[PDB]
Amino acid sequence: DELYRQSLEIISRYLREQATGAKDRSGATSRKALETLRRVGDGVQRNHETAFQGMLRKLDIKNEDDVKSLSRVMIHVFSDGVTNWGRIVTLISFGAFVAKHLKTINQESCIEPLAESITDVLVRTKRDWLVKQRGWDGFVEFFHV
Numbered sequence: 638d639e640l641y642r643q644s645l646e647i648i649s650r651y652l653r654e655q656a657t658g659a660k661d662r663s664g665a666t667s668r669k670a671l672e673t674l675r676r677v678g679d680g681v682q683r684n685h686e687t688a689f690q691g692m693l694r695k696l697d698i699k700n701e702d703d704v705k706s707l708s709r710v711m712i713h714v715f716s717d718g719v720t721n722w723g724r725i726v727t728l729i730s731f732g733a734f735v736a737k738h739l740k741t742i743n744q745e746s747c748i749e750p751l752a753e754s755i756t757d758v759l760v761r762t763k764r765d766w767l768v769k770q771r772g773w774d775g776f777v778e779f780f781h782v
């Protein structure tokens with residue numbers, strides 16, 4: 638699955654850099670995908686901060702067996718709705734928000750697994766749409782400014 642490896646690399650690096658605050662095959666897209674993500678994902682976290690605040694709170698993340706359980710509550714929400722790049726970035730954006738919180742409570746070791754949960758669901762349930770959109774090229778294309 639190349640579409641998956643690439644999605645995991647992107648979402649993973651975004652999540653890791655967002656939490657750490659420090660930067661870390663299908664090259665000439667991934668770099669633009671990550672670039673677009675930083676821009677719009679940051680916007681989404683900013684303009685939607687109080688809703689993110691409240692959700693993180695509703696979630697109550699205290700430890701490792703809180704992230705695992707997460708997938709339940711997460712598939713529930715990304716899966717209810719229409720497919721568009723706007724709901725995908727909010728999916729990944731909140732993921733970034735959770736990652737920020739994890740490094741706060743010493744559970745940075747659960748960031749990569751978190752990025753996996755997110756990636757598994759994004760490409761497991763909308764893989765065909767992604768293929769249709771030409772993957773991350775569609776993403777970058779959609780958000781040009």
Ligand SMILES: O=C(O)c1ccc2c(c1)N(CC1CCC1)C[C@H](c1ccc(Cl)cc1Cl)CO2
Pocket residue numbers: 688689692707710711714715724725727728729731732735751755
């Ligand atoms: O309604 C939408 O357009 C919408 C689209 C996607 C989306 C969400 C809302 N949610 C809910 C909102 C309120 C706080 C963000 C977060 C959720 C989610 C993403 C990542 C993790 Cl790590 C856990 C969860 Cl639970 C699933 O991703």
